């Protein structure tokens with residue numbers, strides 16, 4: 001649905017989890 | 029999960045545990061894709077070589093969990109199955125081609141801080157993100173080693189591997205409905221899915237819209253975290269039409 | 280035999 005993939009305790013609060021940046025950095 | 033870490037609270041709110049009713053035990057991972065649909069691997073429900081053939085009433089879905097074995101009162105929700113749908117061309121005889129199944133819940137699950145659906149990829153997100161070297165994230169309550177068991181949900185980030193390296197790592201015939209992921213021996217780092225992680229999601233966070241997408245389903249591996257071997261994942265976007273047809277027809 | 284018993288209701 002419209003809100004899929006946005007986690008209440010991270011994206012919805014603009015908080016990052018401890019390893020998502022590892023994913024972003026691989027998207028070269 | 030081998031060589032992963034404890035998840036953060038709420039890190040994977042689409043994570044689902046498929047739970048056997050008697051004997052009460054973990055059967056597989058799975059994922060929440062709407063308030064009434066759960067995605068998993070077909071082999072979690074149907075695998076005749078191992079005399080596995082589960083029916084709706086054999087199972088429960090536990091959503092919002094963190095701890096593997098505890099009943100997480102006031103956090104997790106437990107749902108019954110209304111119907112199981114396995115891909116009609118799932119190949120259990122040979123190589124687990126099209127290793128995908130859908131489960132419809134009897135009643136909608138209430139979303140919360142711990143329960144929230146993952147997105148499924150459209151063609152453009154798939155084409156952009158399913159590239160060798162790009163990393164996804166695998167989660168599950170399966171074994172910590174090839175043969176303890178984890179106290180809580182485990183997470184590991186792993187790079188997608190080039191299709192020739194996937195193919196050259198195994199004698200099994202690989203199809204376009206699969207991809208493989210994991211580090212190579214010379215990369216230092218390691219990690220893999222293992223027994224019990226079957227059916228759980230491989231997810232990627234889109235840098236275009238900052239949403240999580242489920243690109244893969246944990247399907248098969250020869251051993252766990254062996255050097256020179258890789259985990260194989262059902263290619264969710266390649267099977268999207270079937271997913272859509274099921275949800276369109278059966279709601 | 281690992282798991283905490285879940286509520287009977289389920």
Ligand SMILES: N[C@H](Cc1ccccc1)C(=O)N1CCC[C@H]1C(=O)NCc1ccccc1
Pocket residue numbers: 071075122123124200220221222223224225226246247248249250251252259260
């Ligand atoms: N070891 C087999 C390999 C295989 C592959 C394709 C056809 C027949 C056998 C396997 O992974 N199996 C046999 C059927 C279930 C699946 C499994 O254990 N998957 C769980 C798993 C996923 C990723 C890494 C390790 C284990």
Ligand code: NA
Pocket residue numbers: 195196197198199200
């Ligand atoms: Na080969």
Ligand code: NA
Pocket residue numbers: 210211220253254255256257258
């Ligand atoms: Na490996």
